């Protein structure tokens, strides 16, 4: 079996440094081990500390498995259940179990066998009635909290872990289901699996199931040893219970007071035989799956989440179509007359801005998953690179490409723009590039930010500032010499400039050309080239492709920054 | 005392109609009355049904207080605690208690006395350590769940209610605090207060506190009567417990199975003496505070929430200032030259759009409170009109007015616009009006909508469509005769038109005027009046003020629509 141990553990949290956990020692031999205590004692903190999930800065003690230190593949053989559930709502139960099993369990086993285990676990936890039901979403009524909790438990139970940690496995579950869950854990722990869990308000039948007990309170350790001997240990010191029915309530009624009480009990413990014995024993003793597989399964999960979140995919497509048709009707039949310039520039500007501002929604779905991503990374699911590229090939690439195609296909021929294929495809390509660059910038800004409202604000502000330098609201030749340099950071500038260059080039907007020919007018701006020059634009085709290479470089740089912001993030 | 009763209750929920509650009967005499049952049984549903919070369409039975029907002032003397807490996070505990006491309790009592009661309740619930701490927020670490729950309880406990309903008063609380809470309830119920509550996993000491028991399961009623006699009732029929320690666990172990089991037990009950007796008894028996006070306290709460939510007030002000300065630097020194027209129109358009699009954030804070508003309305806090006007005088009026002032004060003199006071104040007034109209439209759209992402999408789309008709992106004289009518629904059109009219009117943009004077150029658009005409604008001052009256009418109409959308909302 696995004989976990610890000695002289202490912990600190930061400015001022608070000591959540003080001197703690104990041994957790195979079987069933529990951690009772009141709220705020330090239950969850200790549990994470034992499962290598707290920053090692505060930790100041030795955690040893079987005497030898922590194995490097430790996280590949231990499961951890979270106090607050982390389960993708837009998926079903079975999808999530398949995902966890697929990424964590080895791929030598056939898919039929993994599905077999999944069915077995569903039976064990009593989830047949909601096996295929969707977990909670803001649009669909969610499954009951108990079923969600059992799902979180199963996602880790399927891994066949030799060591298992649970933080409040039974919170909100009715008594019968909780009894079923714990009987299952006992049946499993009688095979060598070393289980460690916290719990609130057990019943006596449960309390007889224990094999080792730990009692945390205000950081300090009150008692550690066999479950049976705890009552007698207290009996000797005092509190002749003889009246309470459930020993757990009795144990807490002493912590809660029913010189300082905490210190008194803790010193009684350190003067107990149990602590001497455990100090004696302590002193005496002292990735699974390749890159491609991770990428594929992450991308599939994101496919499903995106299709199930119908405010960034379907709403976006529909509004794009409606806008395209409306624009087509409004600007219909563009004329080479006085009004031609205004309409043409306006439509191009609108398309550019809409592409730029349509990326906020997609990244926002990337922000919310932060916590989920951290939990899944620590647990040992996927690398960082895999998660990044997966979310890219699932969200950024597919959905952002379509709007440009639809917009151009509808608009170009209704309005009456340049009647050449080259211009058509150039317009489509340019819109794609601005869209991707905006999404990249949003990812860079919003990567590793917990809150969405702040990120949305920042991105919106940045886009506004970029828009002021587009080329239509202000003429860029009037910009002061000490601020024109800012115009090179503007995505809309490159997109709009490139769209204007390929449209106005072969155009003349003064209808009377013989009349215009004899005496041209100084302040007339008849032709497209003159307007182009006045806005400060080159005429050479290099003057067009320069914007595209700039956009590509921006894409590369911003994606790299996002990857690093994720990499040096605090995953603890 | 208060002798509640019910008879033949049934309930339905809708398309297909599901019957959540079947035949139910019982009496809840003064004292302590509990409602045990498993998840999904119908606990919360029954509790709401008894407290007049379910739509009366499904209800099909008689709820009688002391034989006489439900008094009209019933909600003025009964408190109701919610299963999921509804407590304003941005406030402290004491602020919330003051708010509830101020609006619900009468104003004859002095404020010192109300504060006295608040302190007493804080002592009763054990919240001295977190009395002034802020409740959970997305920026500040939140207080523990137990303290939040106790706060929700106190907000209703302070009312001195003759009848009190609780849905899971003790969920997540540690045993000691829960014991304290229930001992408090018992001490209070021994004075005539009739308490009715649900609960999960009581302990035996608690179970002895009961005076009446109700056992719901899958809608059906399993047992109703004195707490003591329940065990013997089962004993007679079966299940010779004699082994379980806590009777509550025993009672549920029979519902959960530890021809159909549910129907069998229910029929055993209807064949019991208890049901005969209660059927016999049933057959035998068968605003506080004015408008101004509500308005003031609602407005104060919104002051505090807005100042505590630093993403719609402080961020907005700061970004406004930064944008104003940047604009001032960019367009600095506008010249009456060829470029004058483009820069002038662009700056005006930008200000208009920014005012229009800056209203999404404020309304979004109005959306999230929907659920809270419904709960507070039903409980009997405030009228609808009060809540509306309060949120208006707190959020819409103050914050939306400032941006225009700041924008104009900074911009007008840096750029070099019309050097006349009249134009300055006209510009300020116009910006105010567009801002208010946009906020009104957002309120109309977002009133009575549960989700924020959908509302944000809708408002953004509407503003975009309005913007396409502003007057700059497209010339409105080229619009087809069968779509120009849509331009009269555009707020930015009125604002932008009014800003342009008072600026370009006294301007000439062709620098060589003697050169221009001898031979004017057809396609020249030198003066401001010509450009104004070409965009399709009247020159008479009525041609300016018409936009303002239109904006005012839009404001009035949209606010009225919002009020009605709230009024005919389903408050049940
Ligand atoms: C003048 C108008 C035209 C020019 C507009 C320029 C926009 C540039 C946008 C890209 C910047 C970027 O990508 O920011 C990248 C930075 C990089 O973060 P980090 O340093 O690696 O943090 C490391 C974190 N650790 C320690 C955990 C690793 O992300 C941020 O700081 C997030 C906030 C950025 C706000 C930027 C607002 C800029 C407003 C400019 C107003 C004049
Ligand atoms: C060219 C410039 C275009 C400008 C368009 C501006 C439209 C503004 C209308 C506001 C009406 C309003 O807000 O009314 C309020 C309505 C609902 O009202 P209700 O049914 O009474 O709900 C009360 C029901 N109760 C009483 C039972 C509770 O909200 C909405 O419908 C929100 C959807 C509006 C979508 C607008 C999309 C426009 C697309 C146009 C494509 C050509
Ligand atoms: C989508 C229309 C447009 O992109 C455009 O092409 O013209 C200009 C402009 C636009 C959108 C927005 N703004 C603008 O000035 C300001 C703005 C704020 C928005 C906010 C508030 N931000 C200031 C954080 C949102 O929450 C959601 C969408 C938002 N969209 C916009
Ligand atoms: N990262 C942290 N930053 C600040 N305070 C913390 C941090 N982690 C814990 N604490 C503080 O330590 C105290 C106890 O936290 P802890 O995680 O141990 O809860 P707990 O004892 O396990 O009870 P429960 O399971 O119900 O959450 C709390 O007051 C908490 O504020
Ligand atoms: N408005 C509703 N729409 C759809 N289903 C509903 C609605 N109200 C109740 N139900 C369903 O009726 C069943 C019983 O719901 P109920 O509210 O009574 O549970 P409960 O008594 O509150 O238990 P608990 O408080 O622990 O969650 C549930 O399956 C629930 O989904
Ligand atoms: C119908 C037209 C005229 C409306 C204009 C387009 C916008 C306002 C409409 C078009 C289709 C709509 C979507 C249609 C379907 C869904 C799925 C539903 O579970 C939530 C709302 C949501 C996401 C709608 C949001 C609003 C929406 C995007
Ligand atoms: C951290 C982020 C914002 C870095 C910003 C880097 C951007 C602005 C850099 C990356 C590559 C650069 C471009 C490289 C080459 C060209 C072609 C030249 O004939 C004009 C300048 C131009 C177009 C540069 C403009 C600035 C540019 C686009
Ligand atoms: C481009 C310029 C104008 C950006 C303006 C950003 C300023 C105005 C915004 C951006 C993010 C905002 C911060 C977001 C979160 C917090 C944490 C909170 O505990 C105090 C307020 C504080 C610190 C906000 C203050 C306002 C803030 C700093
Ligand atoms: C439910 C919502 C969309 C109501 C829409 C009502 C708006 C569009 C109505 C309300 C008041 C109306 C305005 C009242 C007076 C004038 C002045 C006149 O010289 C031109 C028309 C104009 C400007 C009207 C246009 C239409 C108008 C603005």
Numbering used by the authors:
A (entry chain A), B (entry chain B): 34 to 47, 58 to 301, 326 to 353, 369 to 654
Task: Give sentences from the paper.
ABCG2 is an ABC transporter of broad substrate specificity expressed in various tissues and tissue barriers. ABCG2 also functions as a multidrug transporter and exports a wide range of xenobiotics and pharmaceuticals, thus strongly impacting their pharmacokinetics. Here we present cryo-EM structures of ABCG2 under turnover conditions containing either the endogenous substrate estrone-3-sulfate or the exogenous substrate topotecan. We find two distinct conformational states in which both the transport substrates and ATP are bound.
In contrast, the turnover sample containing topotecan revealed two well-ordered structures, which we termed turnover-1 and turnover-2 states, resolved at 3.1 Å and 3.4 Å, respectively. In the topotecan-bound ABCG2 sample, the dominant class (88% of the ordered particles) belonged to the turnover-1 state, whereas 12% particles belonged to the turnover-2 state. Whereas the state turnover-1 features more widely separated NBDs and an accessible substrate cavity between the TMDs, turnover-2 features semi-closed NBDs and an almost fully occluded substrate cavity. In turnover-2, the topotecan density was narrower in the horizontal dimension and longer in the vertical dimension, probably reflecting a rotation of the drug compared to the turnover-1 state. In turnover-2, the gap is even smaller, causing the entrance to cavity 1 from within the membrane to be completely sealed and even the opening to the cytosol to be reduced. In turnover-2, the distance between the coupling helices is reduced by another 4.0 Å. We now found that in turnover-2, Q181 and F182 facilitated contacts between TM1 of one ABCG2 monomer and TM5’ of the other, thus helping stabilize the TMD domain closure. In addition, the arginine residue R184 provides a direct contact, in the form of a cation-π interaction, with the adenine moiety of the ATP molecule bound to the opposite NBD. In contrast, the R482 side chain is rotated towards the external side of the membrane in turnover-2, where the guanidinium group contacts side chains and main-chain atoms from TM2 and TM4 in the direct vicinity of F439 (right). The concerted motions of TM1, TM2, and TM5 reduce the volume of cavity 1 by approximately one-third, from ~1300 Å3 in turnover-1 to ~830 Å3 in turnover-244, which is incompatible with the binding of the inhibitor molecules.
